[PDB]
Ligand binder design. Structure first.
Ligand SMILES: Cc1c(CN2CCOCC2)c(=O)oc2cc(OC[C@@H](C)c3ccccc3)ccc12
Lengths: 215, 215
């Protein structure tokens, strides 16, 4: 079947308009209806759009669904942004019994100034190595909003095996920190020329690389 | 409109059976298909039941959906309860005028065993020292329950400045992870013999120590 591709995050100040795209991988966006669901943090989801642009009763007309056949995409547009619009937004369609969801888009209504993350990539420590561990840590500090995406590369190939990322937490400077760790064996860590941590925040992606050496 | 009413919370111990009910307020439960979604906190949800009782590929056969017309309810029944089943569960049906979700049910799996944290201390990266920074990270993974206290030492004396610890977050092994980082100048780092990270969990302390390495 097809995928539905949503940006990981979006942000704006109160009173502004924000748009969340939902691109269909293969086939025609207009072949099947698209729904949008809102989840506020610590809340149950609710439908804000069904059948591309239908608004259920109780959902203000600040929320608007559209289809662009040229780009093969759905969009949810929210005008007059209010703090309660801060939530995760998922688009959803079908082909046959195949329900297809997007990955979700975290919408932040800016409570403070944007801050790009400090990203530090650490190669394995001597002590963990002699315990037969080559865990790498990617430390991500001092960012707002609190939404990041982390991907790892062995040389050039995406890694999915062994990646863990913490949920961003508010630190004493009122900015967010989190860590991504890749649990490698020594044999894996040494069997490559370099590893990489790619951090995406506010659509902007930074990339750090470490290589094996001996000191 | 109609509403789907779920319990707020249920608790049960491993290997036992738990049942979550989803009562339709008006209309017959069987007029429309019920879905069940599982959400681990900080994650996108996954479909665990569709069409009242159909399990997607990769959902364990311990998850069973049912309909009871007389009590106008849907139920999700989890057999052989495991710790990874700790999550929020949401039912969902159709209004033709809407997609409606229940308020969701937090499933607590009682009697999870203690797990001591795995602790890995990383000295400053080379590249970071070239950019005039000397952050140390202490990775704390695989611990239950999800509370730790971290103290840092410069040589043998307490470090009272530049320490941050992330809020522990449940990872895919259903154990917690967190990082403590110490923001030092290159000067502070080279002026000491060593720095230590001391992690206390359930009364047991684990201490790790790194030193400026020479090549
Ligand atoms: C992506 C996805 C899947 C597919 N998974 C992906 C990973 O591999 C297993 C299948 C999937 O099976 O189900 C998904 C359901 C999604 O959202 C449902 C919405 C209405 C909801 C439910 C509960 C709380 C908040 C929101 C969103 C995404 C999914």
């Amino acid at each position: 079947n097809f995928m539905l591709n949503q940006p990981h995050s979006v942000s704006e100040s109160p009173g502004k308009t924000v748009t969340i795209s939902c691109t269909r991988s293969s086939g025609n966006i207009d072949s099947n209806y698209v729904q949008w669901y809102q989840q506020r943090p610590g809340s149950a989801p609710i439908t804000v759009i069904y059948e591309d642009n239908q608004r259920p009763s109780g959902v203000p007309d600040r929320f608007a669904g559209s289809i662009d056949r040229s780009s093969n995409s759905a969009s949810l547009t929210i005008s007059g942004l209010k703090t309660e619009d801060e939530a995760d937004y998922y688009c959803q369609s079908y082909d046959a019994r195949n329900v297809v969801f997007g990955g979700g888009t975290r919408l932040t209504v800016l409570g403070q100034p944007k801050a790009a993350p400090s990203v530090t990539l650490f190669p394995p420590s001597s002590e963990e190595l002699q315990a037969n561990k080559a865990t790498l840590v990617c430390l991500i500090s001092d960012f707002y909003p609190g939404a990041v995406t982390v991907a790892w590369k062995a040389d050039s190939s995406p890694v999915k095996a062994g990646v863990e990322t913490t949920t961003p937490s508010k630190q004493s400077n009122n900015k967010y920190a989190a860590s991504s760790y890749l649990s490698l064996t020594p044999e894996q860590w040494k069997s490559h020329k370099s590893y990489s941590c790619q951090v995406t925040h506010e659509g902007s992606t930074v990339e750090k690389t470490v290589a094996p050496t001996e000191c």
